[PDB]
Amino acid sequence: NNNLYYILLYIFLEIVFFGLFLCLYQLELFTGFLWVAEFAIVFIAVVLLFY
Amino acid sequence: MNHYWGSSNTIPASSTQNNNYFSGGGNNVTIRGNEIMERLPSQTPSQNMVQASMKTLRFYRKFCRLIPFILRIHNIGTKFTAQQAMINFGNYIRERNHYRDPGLIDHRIQLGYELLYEAEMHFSQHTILMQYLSPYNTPLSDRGYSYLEKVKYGNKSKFLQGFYKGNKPTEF
Amino acid sequence: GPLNIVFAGVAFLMFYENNYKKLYLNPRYSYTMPYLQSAKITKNLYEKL
């Protein structure tokens, strides 16, 4: 995939799956932190695309 | 050039580049500009008929260059081609050929530029602006036509055709 | 087809074998299979359900 928006969406889903692995392996706390941080980043990334 | 037609009033090719690298460019002639027009100054006065004729020719050239863009954005390409629209507007100009006052011609050129700008920026409606591009004695291409009065009044003169078809309602 | 029938047979045997080894040949002290294990109240730490 070469569309920037779809690349961003798939990377967001990858972050979700990384957090899911951390949850399964029983590092729950680090799932809560990682997500929010990267979530903010993803948000900013979207704005960058808009520009 | 601080004008709507200035060479720097083109839409950038990309968000980080006006054109490809190593150079610049942009289309301002066959499409609309980047910024909106904010003022349209007066035409410089023409002292004789030569200058007025040159102004008319240049206005017609700009109109012809802008025809395909207007046809695309207004969805009127099936009613007539670009060349047909140019020919119809040329018929309009030819019907305005007898003019001989240069100031009147400058005024008309100003009005023509204004109407062209209105057409190219979706200010007017397509069914309204098509009155300047429509054929004079030919049906439009997007629909069928009736040739009943051609068959019945075949060789009859114009007077007889206008006599058989009245000029007022007949109930009253 | 025959191979589909064979696959269905193997799947059914797998399913039944798993269920049989969960129901029997297995201690039943925690509630895992509903409506097949007892839902009573246990007073001792080790009571069979």
Binding site: - | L57, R61, R65, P68, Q83 | -
Partner: protein
């Protein structure tokens, strides 16, 4: 492009004739030049546009152009 202008006969059309003797007045000349200009996706400079007298000069100019597509 010239097919749209139906007052011009393409059968024995010789390209050295002036536009007027082909049946095109100034407005038709401007329309035809703009149509060719759109056809090849180029622009004619103001001196070049107003200096054209026949189709041979237009053909030569388009031949010498590298941006014509």
């Amino acid at each position: 492009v010239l097919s749209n202008f139906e007052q011009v006969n393409l059968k024995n059309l010789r390209w050295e004739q002036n536009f007027k003797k082909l049946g095109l007045d100034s407005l038709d000349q401007t329309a035809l030049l703009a149509s060719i200009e759109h056809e090849f996706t180029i622009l004619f400079p103001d001196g070049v546009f107003e200096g054209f007298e026949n189709l041979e000069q237009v053909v030569n100019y388009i031949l010498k152009n590298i941006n014509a597509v």
